[PDB]
Every structure is written in C-alpha cells, then in structure tokens.
C-alpha cells in the first residue's frame, strides 16, 4: 500500500479527461436512434477529480415518445425530455461549455473517455450526419475505457462498467444505464487505475 505512494497519479498526457456516456432512444430496436442524455465530466488530468459537469437531457424528434423499454432501461421518463433542447442546440451548448472551461485553447490538451466505442464512433457522428450537423473536432479522438482497463488488468471486461467495478473492488455509483451515473463510474475506475500508476492513452484510430 506504501507500494503505490510514489507511483500513484503519475503525470498524464492530457490536462483534462472528458468523460462522456450517452443514453438514446431505443427498443428491443428503433431508427434513427436519438441522443436523449448528454453528460460530460471534466476531470483534472492528474488526480481524476471531477472539476466541472455538463449535463443535458435532449428532446428527440423522429421518435419523440420514449418507449417502455427505453424508460425502464435508462430511468429517463418522458417528462425529463419534454421541454428540452434538440441535439443541435445541446451541441452548441457543449461548445460554449468547452469554451468557458478553457478546453478550446490550443495549449490545453484534453480527450474524451467513453465506455466502449459506440457513442463517438457510431452514435454521435451517425445522428449528426443524419441531421446535416458537423461533428466538432474534439469528438474525434477518444479513449475507450474497456481497452485501457484490459491493458491495465490483462483482461477484457465483457460486461463493461459492472465487470470493471468488480475487478477493482469498487461499489457501483448510482444507477446503471443512466448517462451521468455511468460517467461517475468511468471517473471512479479511472481514479483507481491512476492510483495504480496507469497512464491513459488514445485508443481511437486517428
Ligand atoms: Mg450509459
């Protein structure tokens, strides 16, 4: 335990890590899928502590009525998405938040962190393409935590956050399949890996 005193929280390659996990319209499946929860956690790059939070629910337009499957899975009821801005508006708000947080200065280095590749490889660019919206350059590089974890632990977490929490002896934070709570769990896992001396790197193909 003194074993880690010098190793823990090493210098990292980024000033900040931006933890993101979407929830989306869905069924068991409807199309196009639309982002209904847009969280970002700004983590101190050294300590992994949460320093700022972006969180918006988003009003879906093509399938505006959340399905029983969607609600029961995500916890997101209709009342939570009803008066809310559209994805385009939410993306402008993210950009304002990036600006306000000093994340758009060329000298300030940050990278998104997600559980899996779906959200930034598939979901965001897919919906943006459908809407005719550009994808900001900062969404185009990320770290898949499942891959970071498998490198650190020599073991693929098939069941995602629940497997990673198990492997690191961490109690689950909040509610599974809630965007923000998944973000808090990603952040907690990162903290523990950093405590063990893990240096995070882009996993996203350039
Ligand atoms: Mg989630």
Curated annotation (Swiss-Prot):
Active-site annotation: 23, 177
Organism: Homo sapiens (Human)
Binding annotation for Mg(2+) 2: 21, 119
Quaternary organization: Interacts with PRNP.
Cofactor note: Binds 2 magnesium ions per subunit.
UniProt-recorded name of the protein: ERI1 exoribonuclease 3
Gene name of the record: ERI3
Binding site for Mg(2+) 1: 21, 23, 182
Complete-protein stretch covered: 137 to 336 of 337
Group of enzyme by EC: hydrolase
GO molecular function, one term: RNA binding
Swiss-Prot/TrEMBL keywords: Exonuclease, Hydrolase, Magnesium, Metal-binding, Nuclease
Span of domain Exonuclease: 17-190
Residue sites binding AMP per the record: 23, 177
EC number of the protein: 3.1.-.-
Requisite cofactors: Mg(2+)
